[PDB]
Design a protein around this motif. Structure first.
Motif, PDB file in Angstrom:
ATOM      1  N   UNK A 205      33.443  31.521  37.110  1.00 26.18           N
ATOM      2  CA  UNK A 205      33.883  31.919  35.780  1.00 26.18           C
ATOM      3  C   UNK A 205      34.217  33.399  35.811  1.00 26.18           C
ATOM      4  N   UNK A 206      35.304  33.773  35.154  1.00 26.45           N
ATOM      5  CA  UNK A 206      35.744  35.153  35.231  1.00 26.45           C
ATOM      6  C   UNK A 206      34.637  36.091  34.772  1.00 26.45           C
ATOM      7  N   UNK A 207      34.454  37.213  35.455  1.00 26.75           N
ATOM      8  CA  UNK A 207      33.589  38.264  34.926  1.00 26.75           C
ATOM      9  C   UNK A 207      34.147  38.899  33.685  1.00 26.75           C
ATOM     10  N   UNK A 208      35.326  38.483  33.251  1.00 21.33           N
ATOM     11  CA  UNK A 208      35.918  38.978  32.025  1.00 21.33           C
ATOM     12  C   UNK A 208      36.038  37.883  30.982  1.00 21.33           C
ATOM     13  N   UNK A 209      35.138  36.904  31.032  1.00 21.21           N
ATOM     14  CA  UNK A 209      35.221  35.786  30.108  1.00 21.21           C
ATOM     15  C   UNK A 209      35.151  36.264  28.676  1.00 21.21           C
ATOM     16  N   UNK A 210      34.252  37.193  28.396  1.00 20.14           N
ATOM     17  CA  UNK A 210      34.068  37.599  27.018  1.00 20.14           C
ATOM     18  C   UNK A 210      35.323  38.250  26.466  1.00 20.14           C
TER      19      UNK A 210
END
Ligand SMILES: *[C@@H]1O[C@H](CO)[C@@H](O[C@@H]2O[C@H](CO)[C@@H](O)[C@H](O)[C@H]2NC(C)=O)[C@H](O)[C@H]1NC(C)=O
Ligand SMILES: *[C@@H]1O[C@H](CO)[C@@H](O)[C@H](O)[C@H]1NC(C)=O
Ligand SMILES: *[C@@H]1O[C@H](CO)[C@@H](O)[C@H](O)[C@H]1NC(C)=O
Ligand SMILES: *[C@@H]1O[C@H](CO)[C@@H](O)[C@H](O)[C@H]1NC(C)=O
Lengths: 286, 101, 374, 91, 49, 49, 101
Positions: free
Chosen positions: F36-41
């Motif tokens: 999951x992207x570390x930039x999901x948020x």
């Protein structure tokens, strides 16, 4: 009707007590620190330009409640707290999201098969799949030589009768049994662990058997055909074949009742007990 | 450089204008040349269709239009293009090993 | 000429040519009355499903044959003690044996003979597909009861703890319950706040419970709102809807097709319903089909296999069969043979032999399948 | 991502006037799609799918790292602002 | 105040008296609810593909 | 017959037919989890919001 | 207040449901899609004349119903076909990979 397969289904890992599930408890402690971090940074920024309160303030901001009456007196902490609250929203959202993701997406299950599943064209150890000897199934196999590798590989396990086979697959002695529908489906609907699989083979039908040409043979045929219009036949079903149902479907989303929330219900009571003697020692500080 | 037709439609001036061609295969060709010591002069085909084996004349003969035609009749002596492999084509021509599956 | 079994078509006008798969199929009777009308031999060629099985049989029993279409009637409902239709064309020994599509049943089964059937079939129902059959109880779905009552008792006990701790540390039940409840529910509400560190801690940790609870609950609801079930409405001819037609609604429209077999069944088990149906006949198939697309017609009753075909081949990938194939008046197709040809036995053993070698897999998977099969 | 790319084959000792025949033969085979059936009869397996998704969980990972970074950004900007009060301690 | 309102108003704050502002801030919060709910939905979207 | 990759060193001591099926050198590696992207948020919004 | 929570939740839920679940799309096909075994009006699907594709079809007679049904639309060259399918003149074009991809 026609032939199908059957095989023991595996129960899904729908975990309830897993409450802390989406967070890798490490991260939780990380939160538990960062909170006080910003708290002390706050009252520091206060004293220079309300040193126990800010603790309350922050923990409130995270838990949406419980409010004291603190505030920023400075200008800096104004921006501080603002973005702090932002952070808070981000957390709680994300948490909801991943809980949803876990709860709805299930395992990729592969018990499903067909007839052309290679896993039934090139057997190994882990696939013994028998049938009932001297049974029509057998005759269908051997006379289709292109299936021979199956045929012979099965001959070394073929069973004796229905009850034998079913009671066998109850306990994983085999993996797959292969028989005809209007027995297996009734089974899977009455007993509650077994389940059919992909489509059929042998569009055959059952039937009354005669001798060679005892006359009134012909007679009986007529009667049967009639019965298929007065529903009488069609009636007999509800009387015998499709009455008992274990509600059975795909992997359905399941309401949760108490196997989960107890997981934190207990925490509730804990917060209780601690309190009381904290009370005592609170008076102590007093 | 690349001598070719202005065959935008049947009945054109047919003026065999020179143009310039380039890209993938041309690159391949150049490498082959500089490693194979010869010279060369490309030029597009007459019609534009690759080539198949058709009876004609309303007589008992079947020839190829298309590139392979100008391969067999001598107009040319090597085809470098996106040319498929097959059976029939492998009857009257030889094929180098493939170079892009 | 039923739809996906016996397709007909005309030769390429070049040289009587067609498409080696088919076989010659003249309908050498041309319906005409003004002139003497010598039966015109208009050669055509047919192909499909039934035809193939015909061909394989013939090869395996070593005979030959021509085809010969039909003119008067289609499947021959008998009239005035007389059989028109192809049953006609075989009972009056003008044509030896009939294939195509003839449901088996009593009335037929005593004037001719029958083979062993190919494929399951019978009477079933088609109905357009509705939308959004989400339970009217969706909101109450994602919980049992035990959650709510466990909540309640937790309320009471923590309230009591508020009483027992708040009086001695350093205006309780008149509010405390109210406060705590509100907290559980996204505390819009306003309320006075309990001073004193004990209660402060208590209520805080309670709210912690609150957040988890709410978030979970929303997740679960989002779960259920993804696995619907599209529970169909009519549920078998036994339904009273198909019995109180004008009564318990703006009446339905039980389209059918006359002259057929099915009709011959209905009018022998629910004559009452047959009466109300009478005024909705839809000649041919496509008529009813379109009329079903555009509201003229409410639900449709007809032979099965033709439906389990016409379904999986319609662009809007939804028409439907009512009960996922709840074939109920159940029988098979077959092959007609005029009485007592010592052949019958041979045909029989032959077709069974065919079922042996799974070819009625390939034929099936080559014609009677379609997209939207899910 | 096959990259050093070639094919299997069939060995033949040098210059048998056969070679041509084998060649035309196998090509003939590719014609009639039988190298469909053989392929679909042996060189296939379950799990043949493009993509999927598994219920990952328990994220103490670079994502929340980025979030915490956006956090500490606050402390940075705050200290930046702080001294500004010194400026008007002189005006 | 207004910011806090947008963000699930943990925060405490004095309230503007007077019907005009009352109406204003109320309808603003209406915007808030939609916004937050949407956002969560979208995040739940990405956490599935 | 059997399985003999084609290549230069071989291709001059014997001959070769026309190949059956694509092939060559590739890599296998066990499968990780949760990319999951570390930039999901920051994902579900543009900036203009 | 209870009611209130119920609303806002439900609303979120259904927004999610809409946003994540897409249409069931059926442009997907194979080669054995019956929709390419029993053509109708709505499926003209041509190719490039005199091209290797053609040779593959006709010599596989079991596909003949396809073959002939296609012959009445076959195009002239790549650009022709592609520029065609830009504007739904046809529905499906059938060619080789290292151009289409
Ligand atoms: C069976 O099909 C016939 C079509 O042949 C229809 O019947 C009537 O059709 C005949 C044939 O031309 C006409 O002569 C009659 O005038 C029609 N109406 C009657 C007999 O009332 C009809 O679809 C079916 N037959 C019946 C009796 O309904
Ligand atoms: C049947 O037809 C005959 C003439 O063929 C006629 O006399 C008789 O009345 C008819 N009866 C019925 C019931 O159709
Ligand atoms: C279902 O939706 C369609 C169009 O989306 C429309 O006919 C109507 O809203 C519903 N019709 C039925 C039969 O459910
Ligand atoms: C992925 O999960 C497995 C077990 O679920 C375990 O090996 C480890 O947590 C992860 N391993 C890899 C290679 O990603």
């Amino acid at each position: 009707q026609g032939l199908t397969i059957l095989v023991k289904k595996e129960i899904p890992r729908s975990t309830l007590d897993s409450f802390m599930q989406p967070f890798q408890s490490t991260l939780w402690l990380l939160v538990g620190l960062s909170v006080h971090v910003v708290a002390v940074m706050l009252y520091l920024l206060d004293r220079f330009s309300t040193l126990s309160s800010a603790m309350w303030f922050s923990w409130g901001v995270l838990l949406n409640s419980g409010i004291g009456e603190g505030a920023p007196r400075s200008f800096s902490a104004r921006i501080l707290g603002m973005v702090w609250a932002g952070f808070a929203m981000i957390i709680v959202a994300s948490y909801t999201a991943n809980l949803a993701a876990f709860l709805v997406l299930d395992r990729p299950e592969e018990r499903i098969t067909g007839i052309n599943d290679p896993r039934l064209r090139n057997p190994s150890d882990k696939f013994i799949y028998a049938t009932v000897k001297q049974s029509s199934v057998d005759i269908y196999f051997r006379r289709q030589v292109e299936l021979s590798t199956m045929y012979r590989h099965m001959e070394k396990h073929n069973y004796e009768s229905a009850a034998e086979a079913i009671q066998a697959v109850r306990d994983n002695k085999l993996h797959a049994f292969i028989w005809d529908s209007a027995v297996l489906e009734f089974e899977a609907s009455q007993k509650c662990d077994l389940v059919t699989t992909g489509e059929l083979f042998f569009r055959s039908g059952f039937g009354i058997g005669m001798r060679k040409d005892s006359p009134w043979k012909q007679q009986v045929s007529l009667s049967i055909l009639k019965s298929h219009e007065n529903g009488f036949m069609e009636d007999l079903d509800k009387t015998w074949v499709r009455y008992q149902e274990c509600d059975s479907r795909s992997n359905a989303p399941a309401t949760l009742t108490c196997e989960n929330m107890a997981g934190v219900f207990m925490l509730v009571a804990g917060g209780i007990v601690a309190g009381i003697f904290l009370i005592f020692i609170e008076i102590a500080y007093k | 450089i690349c001598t070719g037709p202005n065959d935008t439609s049947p009945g054109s001036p047919r003026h065999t204008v020179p143009q310039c061609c380039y890209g993938f295969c041309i690159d391949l060709l150049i490498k082959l040349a500089r490693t194979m010591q010869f010279t060369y002069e490309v030029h597009l085909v007459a019609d534009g269709k690759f080539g198949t084996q058709e009876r004609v004349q309303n007589s008992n003969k079947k020839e190829w239009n298309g590139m392979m035609g100008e391969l067999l009749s001598g107009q040319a002596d090597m085809i470098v293009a996106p040319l498929t492999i097959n059976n029939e084509r492998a009857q009257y021509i030889e094929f180098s090993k493939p170079f892009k599956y | 000429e039923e739809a996906p079994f016996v397709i007909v078509e005309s030769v390429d006008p070049l040289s009587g040519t067609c498409m080696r798969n088919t076989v010659p199929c003249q309908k050498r009777i041309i319906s005409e009355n003004k002139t003497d009308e010598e039966p015109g031999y208009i050669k055509k060629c047919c192909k499909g499903f039934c035809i193939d099985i015909l061909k394989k049989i013939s090869k395996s029993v070593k005979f030959t044959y021509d085809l010969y279409l039909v003119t008067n009637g289609k499947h021959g409902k008998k009239i005035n003690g007389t059989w028109n239709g192809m049953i006609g064309e075989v009972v009056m020994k003008r044509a030896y044996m009939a294939v195509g599509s003839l449901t088996i049943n009593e009335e037929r089964s005593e004037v001719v003979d029958f083979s062993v059937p190919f494929i399951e079939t019978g009477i079933s129902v088609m109905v357009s597909r509705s939308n959004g059959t989400v339970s009217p109880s969706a909101f109450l779905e994602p919980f049992s009861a035990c959650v709510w009552v466990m909540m309640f008792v937790m309320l009471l006990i923590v309230s009591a703890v508020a009483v027992f701790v708040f009086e001695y540390f350093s205006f309780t039940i008149g509010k405390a319950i109210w406060l705590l409840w509100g907290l559980v529910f996204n505390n819009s509400v306003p309320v006075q706040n309990p001073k004193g560190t004990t209660s402060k801690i208590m209520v805080s940790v309670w709210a912690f419970f609150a957040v988890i609870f709410l978030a979970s609950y929303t997740a679960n609801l989002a779960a259920f709102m993804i696995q619907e079930e599209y529970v169909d409405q009519v549920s078998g001819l036994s339904d009273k809807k198909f019995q109180r037609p004008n009564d318990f609604s703006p009446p339905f429209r039980f389209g059918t097709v006359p002259n057929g077999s099915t009709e011959r069944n209905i009018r022998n088990n629910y004559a009452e319903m047959h009466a109300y149906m009478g005024k909705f006949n839809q000649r041919g198939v496509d008529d009813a089909l379109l009329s079903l697309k555009t509201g003229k017609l409410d639900a449709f009753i007809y032979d099965a296999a033709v439906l389990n075909y016409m379904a999986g081949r319609d662009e809007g990938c939804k028409l439907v069969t009512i009960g996922s194939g709840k074939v109920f008046a159940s029988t098979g197709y077959g092959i007609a043979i005029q009485k007592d040809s010592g052949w019958k036995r041979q045909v029989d053993l032959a077709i069974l032999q065919l079922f042996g070698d799974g070819e009625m897999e390939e034929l099936e998977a080559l014609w009677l399948t379609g997209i939207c099969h899910n | 991502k096959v990259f050093a790319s070639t094919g299997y084959g069939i060995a033949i000792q040098k210059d048998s006037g056969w070679k041509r025949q084998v060649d035309l033969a196998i090509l003939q085979l590719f014609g009639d799609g039988e190298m469909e059936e053989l392929e679909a009869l042996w060189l296939t397996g379950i799990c043949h799918n493009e993509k999927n998704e598994v219920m990952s969980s328990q994220l103490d990972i670079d994502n929340m790292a980025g979030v915490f970074y956006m956090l500490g950004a606050a402390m940075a900007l705050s200290l930046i602002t702080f001294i500004s009060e010194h400026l008007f301690y002189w005006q």
